């Protein structure tokens, strides 16, 4: 917690966040893993959306700000809402060299 | 309920600790465990043991186990500090009736 005037209060917290990140592809890709999709087992709760499952440390996505557990909302202006897993795979495989993604980030 | 025509947040359960009992079938409990001290956390920086996959129907589902549960105790053996494999061996030798304590959160 936080302390102010001898009172233990709840600290300011970022509950939800929407970030726009730009990953630069390298030899071997973007250095991430995606999980989920419409018709796949949810990665979190009942959410069949696409989430980052692995971020290769000191890799392209690591340097761009990606964090494991982020939900992938758009890639280069193409929204993944309702997309099946493999549709997202080909979207991230064809995003080019610079892959600009808007993600959604939770607290814990 | 409402407060001056303004909706009130409903009652919420933030976290709970359950004691469940799995009856082993076919020699398996019908769950997957992930994590352990010295392994990549399953959630955040918590290095504990977490139920990752509850098999459809099967022992754990009927017992109440759910994905995301953190396993705390198994037949009186505390898992605080257990590595993945020390947790595996504990759950494999837990015998026919495996009584588990878990910690569950809301998402």
């Amino acid at each position: 917690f936080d302390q102010a005037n001898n009172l233990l209060i709840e600290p300011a917290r970022i509950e939800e966040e929407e970030l726009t990140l730009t990953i630069l592809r390298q030899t071997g890709g973007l250095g991430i893993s995606i999980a989920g999709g419409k018709g796949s087992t949810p990665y979190k709760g009942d959410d069949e959306g696409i989430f980052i499952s692995r971020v290769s440390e000191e890799g392209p996505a690591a340097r761009a700000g990606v964090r494991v557990g982020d939900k992938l909302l758009e890639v280069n202006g193409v929204a993944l809402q309702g997309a099946e897993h493999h549709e997202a795979v080909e979207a991230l495989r064809g995003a080019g060299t610079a892959v600009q993604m808007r993600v959604w980030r939770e607290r814990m | 309920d409402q407060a001056n025509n303004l909706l009130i947040e409903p009652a919420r359960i933030e976290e709970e600790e359950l004691t469940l009992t799995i009856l082993r079938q076919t020699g398996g409990l019908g769950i997957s465990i992930a994590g352990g001290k010295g392994s990549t956390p399953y959630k955040g920086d918590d290095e504990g043991i977490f139920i990752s996959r509850v098999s459809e129907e099967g022992p754990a589902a009927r017992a109440g186990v759910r994905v995301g549960d953190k396993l705390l105790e198994v037949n009186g053996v505390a898992l605080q500090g257990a590595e993945h494999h020390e947790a595996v061996e504990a759950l494999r030798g837990a015998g026919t009736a495996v009584q588990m304590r878990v910690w569950r959160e809301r998402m």
Binding site: R54, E57 | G28, L29, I31, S32, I33, A34, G35, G36, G38, S39, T40, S52, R53, H84, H85, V88, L91, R92
Partner: peptide, 8 residues
């Protein structure tokens, strides 16, 4: 970076 998951 040890990701470990087992089926019990």
């Amino acid at each position: 970076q040890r990701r470990r998951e087992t089926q019990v």
